[PDB]
Amino acid sequence: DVSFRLSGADPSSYGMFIKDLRNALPHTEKVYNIPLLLPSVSGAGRYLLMHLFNYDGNTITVAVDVTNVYIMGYLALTTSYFFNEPAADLASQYVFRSARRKITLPYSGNYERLQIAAGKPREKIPIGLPALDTAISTLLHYDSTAAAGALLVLIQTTAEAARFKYIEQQIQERAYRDEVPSSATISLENSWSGLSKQIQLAQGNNGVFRTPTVLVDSKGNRVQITNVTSNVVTSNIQLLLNTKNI
Numbered sequence: 001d002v003s004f005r006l007s008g009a010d011p012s013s014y015g016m017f018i019k020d021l022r023n024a025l026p027h028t029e030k031v032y033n034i035p036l037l038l039p040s041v042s043g044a045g046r047y048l049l050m051h052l053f054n055y056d057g058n059t060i061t062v063a064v065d066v067t068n069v070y071i072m073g074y075l076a077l078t079t080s081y082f083f084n085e086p087a088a089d090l091a092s093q094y095v096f097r098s099a100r101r102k103i104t105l106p107y108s109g110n111y112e113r114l115q116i117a118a119g120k121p122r123e124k125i126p127i128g129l130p131a132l133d134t135a136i137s138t139l140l141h142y143d144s145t146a147a148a149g150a151l152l153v154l155i156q157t158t159a160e161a162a163r164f165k166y167i168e169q170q171i172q173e174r175a176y177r178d179e180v181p182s183s184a185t186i187s188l189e190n191s192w193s194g195l196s197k198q199i200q201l202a203q204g205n206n207g208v209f210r211t212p213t214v215l216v217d218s219k220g221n222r223v224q225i226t227n228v229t230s231n232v233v234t235s236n237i238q239l240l241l242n243t244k245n246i
């Protein structure tokens, strides 16, 4: 298990949590020096539990699939909550079995459905450590519309930060003040599977992507990533989605 406390949190303690989260994900291989997530894991071992504590010390436990860093569900006091999708239903067979009741959220866990449920796109939802404290608090008591927004915050400040050093740094910048994600952040989120695939295909293609990945950069400009010498590959992406899962 990995844990993060908002009470006393700073960029350093958040950095430590994101390190712990990455390190909890198993791999047997690195591709271009980046850990390659496993094709599959059987049984309860598929799921990492993240213990998150709000500023007041209240807690939720979040279930994360270690193959793809996908949040499947969470436990808040004695109630479990899972996304409305087959992978989350499967997860519910292994985690939080001792919850007094299980609620299936009225949406799946992808960004398209969550943004619909929340009534707003990610571009308009501030993220940061304060927003993560809010999100934890929101999830403690069921409210499906409020929970959609909370879950967009939770996913970007945990899973997305684990996947990309740039996103981790963005959240660190937002330790004490929320701000909507940069368009580069949005771009990276949207591109992880694509990038993961191209980095793997580059092995056997002399480091060259079979298909260029289009990203938005820090200055707001749109760029093509064509090979493993890109900063996105050398100094940003931290985990690879196995092509078996693409």
Ligand SMILES: *[C@@H]1O[C@H](CO)[C@@H](O)[C@H](O)[C@H]1NC(C)=O
Pocket: 208, 226, 227, 229, 230, 231
């Ligand atoms: C690889 O990417 C860099 C930019 O990141 C580019 O300038 C260079 O020409 C590319 N090399 C090849 C072989 O595509």
Ligand SMILES: Nc1ncnc2[nH]cnc12
Pocket: 069, 070, 071, 072, 109, 110, 111, 155, 159, 160
């Ligand atoms: N539930 C989820 N967990 C991790 N990353 C995601 N990206 C979109 N939905 C996600």
